[PDB]
Amino acid sequence: SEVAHRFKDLGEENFKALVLIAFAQYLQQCPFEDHVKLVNEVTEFAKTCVADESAENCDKSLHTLFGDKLCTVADCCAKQEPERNECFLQHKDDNPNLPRLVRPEVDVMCTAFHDNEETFLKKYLYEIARRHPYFYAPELLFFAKRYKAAFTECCQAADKAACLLPKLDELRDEGKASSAKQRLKCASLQKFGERAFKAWAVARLSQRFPKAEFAEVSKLVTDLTKVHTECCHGDLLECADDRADLAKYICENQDSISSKLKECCEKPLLEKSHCIAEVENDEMPADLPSLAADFVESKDVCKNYAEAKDVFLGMFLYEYARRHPDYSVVLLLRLAKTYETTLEKCCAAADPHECYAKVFDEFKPLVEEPQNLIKQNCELFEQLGEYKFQNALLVRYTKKVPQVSTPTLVEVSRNLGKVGSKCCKHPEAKRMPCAEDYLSVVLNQLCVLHEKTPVSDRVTKCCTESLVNRRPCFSALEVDETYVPKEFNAETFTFHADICTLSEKERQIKKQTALVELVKHKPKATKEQLKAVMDDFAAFVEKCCKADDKETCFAE
Ligand SMILES: CC(=O)O[C@H]1C[C@@]2(C)[C@@H](C[C@@H](O)[C@H]3[C@@]4(C)CC[C@@H](O)[C@@H](C)[C@@H]4CC[C@@]32C)/C1=C(\CCC=C(C)C)C(=O)O
Ligand SMILES: CC(=O)O[C@H]1C[C@@]2(C)[C@@H](C[C@@H](O)[C@H]3[C@@]4(C)CC[C@@H](O)[C@@H](C)[C@@H]4CC[C@@]32C)/C1=C(\CCC=C(C)C)C(=O)O
Numbered sequence: 105s106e107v108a109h110r111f112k113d114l115g116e117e118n119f120k121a122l123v124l125i126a127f128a129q130y131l132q133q134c135p136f137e138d139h140v141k142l143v144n145e146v147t148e149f150a151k152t153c154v155a156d157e158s159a160e161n162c163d164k165s166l167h168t169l170f171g172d173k174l175c176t177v178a179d180c181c182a183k184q185e186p187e188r189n190e191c192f193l194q195h196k197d198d199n200p201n202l203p204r205l206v207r208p209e210v211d212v213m214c215t216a217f218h219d220n221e222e223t224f225l226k227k228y229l230y231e232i233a234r235r236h237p238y239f240y241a242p243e244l245l246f247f248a249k250r251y252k253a254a255f256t257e258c259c260q261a262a263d264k265a266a267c268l269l270p271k272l273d274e275l276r277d278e279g280k281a282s283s284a285k286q287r288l289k290c291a292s293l294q295k296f297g298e299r300a301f302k303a304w305a306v307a308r309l310s311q312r313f314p315k316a317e318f319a320e321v322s323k324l325v326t327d328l329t330k331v332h333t334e335c336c337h338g339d340l341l342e343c344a345d346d347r348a349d350l351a352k353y354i355c356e357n358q359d360s361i362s363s364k365l366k367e368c369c370e371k372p373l374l375e376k377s378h379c380i381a382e383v384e385n386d387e388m389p390a391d392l393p394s395l396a397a398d399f400v401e402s403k404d405v406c407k408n409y410a411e412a413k414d415v416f417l418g419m420f421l422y423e424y425a426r427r428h429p430d431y432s433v434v435l436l437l438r439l440a441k442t443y444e445t446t447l448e449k450c451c452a453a454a455d456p457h458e459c460y461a462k463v464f465d466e467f468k469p470l471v472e473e474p475q476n477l478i479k480q481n482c483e484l485f486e487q488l489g490e491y492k493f494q495n496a497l498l499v500r501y502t503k504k505v506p507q508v509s510t511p512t513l514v515e516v517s518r519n520l521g522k523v524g525s526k527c528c529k530h531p532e533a534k535r536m537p538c539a540e541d542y543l544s545v546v547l548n549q550l551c552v553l554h555e556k557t558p559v560s561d562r563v564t565k566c567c568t569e570s571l572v573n574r575r576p577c578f579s580a581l582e583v584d585e586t587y588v589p590k591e592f593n594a595e596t597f598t599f600h601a602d603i604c605t606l607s608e609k610e611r612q613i614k615k616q617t618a619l620v621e622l623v624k625h626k627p628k629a630t631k632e633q634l635k636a637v638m639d640d641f642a643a644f645v646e647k648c649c650k651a652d653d654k655e656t657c658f659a660e
Pocket of ligand 2: 603604611612614615616618641642643645646647649650
């Protein structure tokens with residue numbers, strides 16, 4: 105019996121939490137109530153399997169169970185595992201048509217919290233999990249514990265509003281970031297594969313643990329991959345389990361891995377795990393040999409490459425990464441691929457050594473591109489400020505892929521612009537990994553949102569073509585020369601007066617949605633003419649909106 109197995113390991117509470125998340129991430133449309141019932145019924149059934157390990161169907165696999173339980177409310181169900189299961193995975197909506205989630209006044213939240221606590225918190229998980237079908241579950245529990253703590257304390261404060269609001273904003277961001285990061289994770293695994301996920305894991309960990317040994321890292325990677333392999337496929341319980349052991353393991357062998365892990369291992373499970381996954385890189389090992397030594401100068405290169413290819417590259421990657429925390433994980437993989445491609449042609453040549461001898465020369469180009477992209481992009485940002493810098497990115501991208509839906513273009517660009525204040529404040533050493541990897545995340549949203557209703561084939565190419573090279577791929581794109589402009593419409597710019605109420609941010613976002621609709625209508629337009637109309641539109645609002653009783657001003 106598996107249900108039993110997992111129950112003993114996670115416990116009543118957590119088992120109850122994870123299972124809620126799984127259902128919320130599968131049938132994002134069903135109401136909170138029907139989820140609860142199924143969660144209990146399923147939990148109930150679990151308690152019996154603990155006693156008798158052969159009762160009803162305690163012998164079955166998780167899926168069969170969870171699958172039939174939902175199939176009592178949910179074509180996915182007209183099949184049988186594994187068929188039945190994966191149908192569900194393919195139907196997770198990344199942009200569900202759920203209603204905006206507004207928050208009642210502070211007083212209500214606190215009463216609702218104080219009265220019933222469990223429900224309050226289960227509601228929390230239900231909402232986040234149904235809107236972010238890929239949210240790294242184990243991690244969601246961490247945010248839940250943090251969420252409870254937010255209220256547990258703020259509600260006994262004086263000015264609750266003052267104490268909560270902030271902590272609440274801090275969680276929306278951090279939780280939003282967490283979700284993107286993981287969506288990329290899953291996307292890697294599901295679209296590109298374990299190997300892909302593995303390489304990324306190798307470089308990234310190797311960067312954080314310069315002192316760990318290739319054989320040590322490789323272990324951490326083989327395990328990590330499994331966690332995520334698991335979490336993404338919906339095996340949320342096993343993911344949470346395995347993830348825990350992995351944390352137990354990293355803490356036990358601390359000395360073999362990093363010296364910054366101390367503070368992480370001296371904390372509760374949940375916080376322990378979050379701490380590790382976010383720890384800063386360990387200091388770099390003192391006297392380290394030159395890469396050129398074993399990977400370009402040695403005459404035994406091609407041989408080793410032929411004996412254990414994947415291992416060799418893994419070593420190459422590990423060795424370059426560990427000593428280059430100032431590069432982004434994508435630049436590394438990129439270099440690593442350049443190396444592999446070279447060995448391939450060079451090894452089947454007359455005098456291999458002479459062929460692959462000047463390989464580091466070809467890295468120079470790939471290494472500067474990002475650096476220049478970053479210097480440039482920050483200089484600009486530094487002069488325009490965040491809002492104007494986003495606008496710069498909004499025009500640029502819209503001209504690039506005019507087909508994309510204005511809403512997507514607005515969010516993506518806004519996000520892309522956040523990189524400015526998110527990274528440009530760091531010294532050159534930490535700027536690239538900060539910047540280019542953050543971009544690969546944002547670009548992944550765009551890729552997934554698009555994937556739903558693919559309209560631009562230029563976006564499709566860049567996205568499917570190569571994971572590691574997307575950011576470059578998009579930067580290539582200039583302006584679509586086949587795009588035949590849109591024709592003004594009224595149904596395209598509903599202006600009804602409900603716009604003098606909205607928050608400041610809600611304004612910019614409207615002033616932004618406009619800017620895109622403009623360019624969508626006048627690509628050939630110029631960055632000079634552009635701001636001129638944009639400025640007139642701002643007056644109309646300012647006008648009409650505080651122009652006595654006028655909903656017609658909008659027409660006039
Ligand atoms: C405007 C605002 O402040 O919204 C906040 C406030 C918010 C709607 C929150 C998401 C979720 O907890 C909400 C529920 C329904 C959660 C369950 C119950 O306990 C409610 C009594 C509670 C009230 C509003 C709250 C607390 C917010 C979010 C979501 C961001 C988070 C992530 C991971 C993407 C937000 O900041 O956008
Ligand atoms: C330059 C600037 O900051 O303008 C901002 C500021 C702005 C002129 C605003 C439109 C409108 O509320 C304005 C009125 C007259 C609304 C009625 C009253 O309460 C005034 C006391 C108020 C002051 C200025 C304000 C708040 C802006 C807009 C319009 C954007 C809205 C949408 C839907 C695209 C803008 O960002 O362009």
